[PDB]
Amino acid sequence: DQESSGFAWWAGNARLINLSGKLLGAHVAHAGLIVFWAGAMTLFELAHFIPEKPMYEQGLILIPHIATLGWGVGPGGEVVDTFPFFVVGVVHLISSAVLGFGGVYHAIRGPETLEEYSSFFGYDWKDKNKMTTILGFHLIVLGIGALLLVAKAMFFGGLYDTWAPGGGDVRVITNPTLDPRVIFGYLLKSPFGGEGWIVSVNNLEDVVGGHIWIGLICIAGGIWHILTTPFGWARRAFIWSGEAYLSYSLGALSMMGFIATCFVWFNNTVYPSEFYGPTGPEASQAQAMTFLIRDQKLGANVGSAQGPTGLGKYLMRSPTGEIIFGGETMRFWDFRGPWLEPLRGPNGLDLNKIKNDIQPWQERRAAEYMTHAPLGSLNSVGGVATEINSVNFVSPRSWLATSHFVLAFFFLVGHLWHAGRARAAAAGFEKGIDRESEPVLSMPSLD
Amino acid sequence: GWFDILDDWLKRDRFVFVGWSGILLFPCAYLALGGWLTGTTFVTSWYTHGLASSYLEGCNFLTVAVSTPANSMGHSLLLLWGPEAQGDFTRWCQLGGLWTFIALHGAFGLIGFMLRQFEIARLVGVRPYNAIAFSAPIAVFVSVFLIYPLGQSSWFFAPSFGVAAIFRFLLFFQGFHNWTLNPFHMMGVAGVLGGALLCAIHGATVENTLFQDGEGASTFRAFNPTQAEETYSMVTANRFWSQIFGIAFSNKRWLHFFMLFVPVTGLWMSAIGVVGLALNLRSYDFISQEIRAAEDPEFETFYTKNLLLNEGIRAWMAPQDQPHENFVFPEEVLPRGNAL
Amino acid sequence: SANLWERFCNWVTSTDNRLYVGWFGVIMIPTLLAATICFVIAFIAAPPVDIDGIREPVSGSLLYGNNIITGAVVPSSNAIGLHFYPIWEAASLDEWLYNGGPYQLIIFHFLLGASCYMGRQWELSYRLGMRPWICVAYSAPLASAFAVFLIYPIGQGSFSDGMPLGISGTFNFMIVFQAEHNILMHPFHQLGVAGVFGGALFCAMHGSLVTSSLIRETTETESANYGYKFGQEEETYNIVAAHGYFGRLIFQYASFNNSRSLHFFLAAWRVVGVWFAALGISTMAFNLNGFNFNHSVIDAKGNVINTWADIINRANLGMEVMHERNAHNFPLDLA
């Protein structure tokens, strides 16, 4: 497809929406940069990773994930095997070639039209079944590893669990979760502060435990659509066009990316902080902890200390759970991490505990998290808005949560412009408005 | 002839128009771009603010700025050959100077350029109106780079011709003039902001009510450069917002005009407002409140709650921002909440 | 009739109802009707609010001592932060009152129905049959309002710090921010102030030219504006004699003959910058504040040379220090 009988150059890829895609290969083409990117950055990451320096202190976005899966970590968040990390990127990277080596082909030297070579499932969008069946494959596909993980979780090594008895430590998920109330129950859970429907997740037992449920649930869908044709209220409802398909599909990411950005900023479970930074709230709670100690250790009663405002410095009271750290810190009385849970109580933070059972391993982890906080400039000078240049550090969470939002946002912009242009074919006014047959120049004037 | 030869020549087409105007536009305008540029790259601004203002010194894009004359000069045009500098392009480059330069040379570039908008306009049989709209900036640039400073103490407190150095110009107002709370400035954002929407909307509102009069996926070519044919159904317009927003921009002379107004107007309201700041006539005031701020130590509005931020902005920056006063604030005198 | 709803179905989608009300309509329409109603009153007459983590009530109602500018309906308190404080969770009506529960109502509501207007912004472009990359323009706006009311809150953990609904409130939300994010030095906001300034300049540009090459149809006594009728077939302006001018006025080729392109440039510029901006807030929402060059320029001995940004930062501390005096019960403003 040349120029005329196509779109302009900036809308290049549109002429590939014509006939049967000359290349799946485009999608595969990059389906490689994406896997190759892991190959580079992963290599690049370890390429800069020191074992002592806290993983999050060394701009490690990629590497922390391997660790979170149980690889190259063990006792504490300490890294013992520089090898495993290296392994994964080396593989992917190389792995990308095959992915690109092929996409690169499918786009120039193969069937410029697989609509004809069709046969094998083949091509054409309106074809309501070739599409039900296709996604169908990719459905068995995903659930496939849902288990892959369950395996790593239950049969190959385990994952990293900060909660895990002793302390952060590679552990094997023995007993995942059965009860559907729990695993499913999260969706029905509050969306707001106190209980995020997805985010709120104390342990791995519910994670890997839930994933299982998703693998099968998801596989049952591929098995499903692959066998049948969508009902009539479905057809009636949704526009079918190659574009329109991207249109929907694309707005599942938008949402999802937010769901990530909103997740990587909030959880200490699936994002341990020993690999990522301490979570925003954790921080302003960590500060609390450090100073509750500083004075209590300096000889202050703490619990009974009337604070400047009228509330009390070290300890304050929340409406539902009775006891938590007080400052402006209150906003985060929902924060939960292993470094502060021992000093917990029935009614809330326990005065008796906090006063005498508050051990040392906490004052030091508490101080690391007080410092290392999700605060920094693009400049990358970690700290308050107005800090001197010196200590620099930007939380993995900062970059992670931030990016995905801007992207996921932008995508939502996409879900629109691709639905806006596609809902248009539906009647044909997408090219414009016909100069001699426009609905409005022939309609009852509003008044 | 003798004049008309100069005219005849400089007046006709030749790509980059050069007119009766150009004579002052081009020269002033050039120097000006240069004036600012040289400073950012090579000129220092230390001998006026004890602050580094050049790539050469190590400053970055957002740092570099062409100073502004120490509070020792005041409003003296600070002439290259004037008593102060005495044609000593290094000292004159040191006592700041480039400022008055950039600013004054510049001040003409505008005068000059607007003229050009007239010249080319009266020559092409159009309504100058564009040239008028352009007051919008002259007024601003006049008030904000000459009037305000001229009203205060020295060229010093005048804008900074910087990226960040100019951001300072903000805060400093918020902090001392508490501009943010000045009606006039308000319409200033009411117009810019209000206008931007007006722009972004007419632009898109138009695009969508475009008659498919081309073939395919390129409604960008399907348009006729040649003749009259309403490209955007004005009818598919009103009957749209009339039902989606309740109102209809029925006409295009006014629409495409009201867009001229919005900004230009607000700008003026800004230029007025700042004129105020010139003679320290500012809207910080708000008695009704402050009078009752005395007693009732427990009543609090954002106004006050905000006004307080300002009061901090003073106490902390003044000492380093206004160096020529050799301010000294002991550890104690500085206002702070319980904590930091 | 076979079913009576049949009429409800065409009415909602009445392509001719004075004011279109789509399916989004049916949610927008009231979500804002309730949202507005709570508002208009909260302003006119509503008690103070402990806002900040303490028990310092901030008054923001005309009947409680507010000039139209000082006016503002205040946020929810650091006590609730993110928890959902709906009218029923509060015991006494007055609780919701004090702990600043109107906010959530007003915010959550408009902030919602707003989007549906965004939908119903396009739903008319479908029933009307017009290209619809229009509703998107509206995004940038809604994004920000969403950013300043929903992201930033989730970012800092409390609706406490979400641009308080009111005039002087915004000013507050602002000055504070600069302090904690140096927003002004943020590459995004730039691209924001970029377009806004642009659009506001283009809005006067494109509006300028058109009226400048307007065309013939009037006396001097008559209003030149009258020369045109709704539903004209040919545009009123003489585009050729316009580009023929503007183009010339510096460069000739930095001009637009492609009316479709130009009107387009107007769309995207404002709408794109504004986005970055909307993202700027949403960016620093999780603390990826603007740049920072404090002490970044030094000499040999190390004696420090203040960058023109160090002043920025100086005036910044003046801000940091004061904001929210009493609560801040610790060295680091970690929130």
Binding site: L441, S445, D447 | V235, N238, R239, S242, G246, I247, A248, S250 | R18, V40, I44, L62, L63, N66, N67, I68, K229, F230, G231
Partner: peptide, 30 residues
């Protein structure tokens, strides 16, 4: 007192919305 002045404006304006939308001079297609 002055707060009625605020509310009076605020209101008569909502009604300038009434008329300008519903008793507004209509668009004549000719």
């Amino acid at each position: 007192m002055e707060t009625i002045t605020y509310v009076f404006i605020f209101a008569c304006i909502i009604a300038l919305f009434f008329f300008a939308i519903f008793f507004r001079e209509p668009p004549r297609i000719t």
